[PDB]
């Protein structure tokens, strides 16, 4: 729901001349996916890790 | 770089004279080369999994003991003389570092 409206919002902005990255902002989210997370900690970018048992 | 040929057959460096050249290395010949990423993984997994039964036996045989039994035992278990030598020489390194540690 949020993604579809967000993609619509930026679409209507690209048609009057203003480029993208101007109606939106840098996102902060949590990360997941087994191999994905392994990379994030191999690169020393992670701060806390929670593992299921 | 490459040596020249003598120009007459039936000799020690026989051949037909030509200007041999050096050619850039093919990407298919770097097969058994060490890479700085695989070594990280192997070290971690070794310290997670541990040693093997026959490995432990030759450790106690190698330390505080002679060395011909170690090589004979390793060949009987591993199959060939060449692999036995490499395993013993590499295995010597791990025990030696621990003592230095």
């Amino acid at each position: 729901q949020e993604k579809k409206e967000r993609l619509l919002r930026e679409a209507t902005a690209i048609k009057e001349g203003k480029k993208k990255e101007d109606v939106s902002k840098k996102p902060y989210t949590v990360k997941y996916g087994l191999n994905h997370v392994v990379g994030l900690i191999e690169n020393k970018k992670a701060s806390l890790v929670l593992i299921a048992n | 770089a490459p040596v020249e040929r003598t120009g007459l057959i039936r000799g020690l460096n026989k051949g037909h004279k030509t200007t041999r050249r050096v050619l850039k290395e093919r990407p298919s010949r770097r097969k058994g080369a060490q890479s700085k990423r695989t070594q990280f993984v192997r070290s971690l997994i070794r310290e997670v999994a541990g040693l093997a039964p026959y490995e432990r036996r030759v450790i106690e045989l190698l330390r505080n003991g002679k060395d011909k039994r170690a090589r004979k035992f390793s060949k009987k278990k591993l199959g060939t003389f060449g692999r036995a030598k490499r395993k013993c020489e590499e295995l010597q390194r791990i025990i030696a570092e621990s003592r230095r540690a």
Binding site: - | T6, L8, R10, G11, L12, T18, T19, R20, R21, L23, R26
Partner: protein, 209 residues
């Protein structure tokens, strides 16, 4: 059961050979089929030749070492020297050999000459007539007599180097210092004794020191 002086026979007719006998009673019939296929293929490739350019190659044994013949494809280094895109080459009929490599410099030189004078003799129709491009043919040197075999028009000029030549007298060189039969004997004996001679020399130096 031999009875007279004959040659000892050996005829490998002891299995059920009669069940696997091949007879070629359709030799002319097949020939006709092959010719029909070639004409159909020639009609499909309307202005292009039928074959594909091959490079020059030397036979790989000590016997047959003298002759040359056609190869399978041009190496990647040969294409780069002539200045031909890696991927465009197969399209325009030049072949490519993934796995051959150039050790000397005469085969390299021979083949780049082959490519260069081929590109000079190559027409190239544009992809769309109403919009020509820079690398196409300018539509006026576009009508000329063409070839279709490409094996006879580009075959090996001479497989074997000329048999004999002539030189003025008093220009004939002199042989090896002592004979040309003693040279062979000496060059043979040296390689026979390479191991022993080097070992004997090495021991003396280390032992004395």
């Amino acid at each position: 059961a031999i009875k007279h002086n004959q040659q000892i026979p050996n005829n490998h007719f002891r299995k059920h050979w009669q069940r696997r006998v091949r007879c070629h009673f359709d030799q002319p019939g097949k020939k006709v089929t092959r010719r029909l296929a070639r004409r159909a293929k020639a009609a499909a490739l309307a202005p292009r030749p039928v074959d594909k350019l091959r490079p020059i190659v030397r036979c790989p044994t000590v016997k047959y070492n003298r002759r040359t013949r056609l190869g399978r494809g041009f190496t990647l280094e040969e294409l780069k020297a002539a200045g031909i895109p890696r991927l465009l080459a197969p399209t325009i009929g030049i072949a490519v050999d993934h796995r051959r490599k150039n050790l000397s410099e005469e085969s390299l030189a021979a083949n780049v000459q082959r490519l260069k004078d081929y590109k000079a003799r190559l027409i190239l129709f544009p992809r769309k007539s109403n919009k020509p491009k820079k690398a196409d043919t300018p539509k006026d040197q576009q009508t000329a007599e063409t070839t279709t075999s490409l094996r006879t028009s580009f075959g090996v000029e001479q497989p074997l180097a000329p048999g004999f030549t002539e030189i003025s007298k008093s220009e004939i060189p002199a042989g090896i210092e002592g004979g040309a039969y003693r040279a062979l004997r000496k060059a043979r004996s040296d390689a026979r004794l390479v191991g022993v001679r080097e070992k004997r020399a090495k021991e003396k130096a280390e032992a004395e020191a």
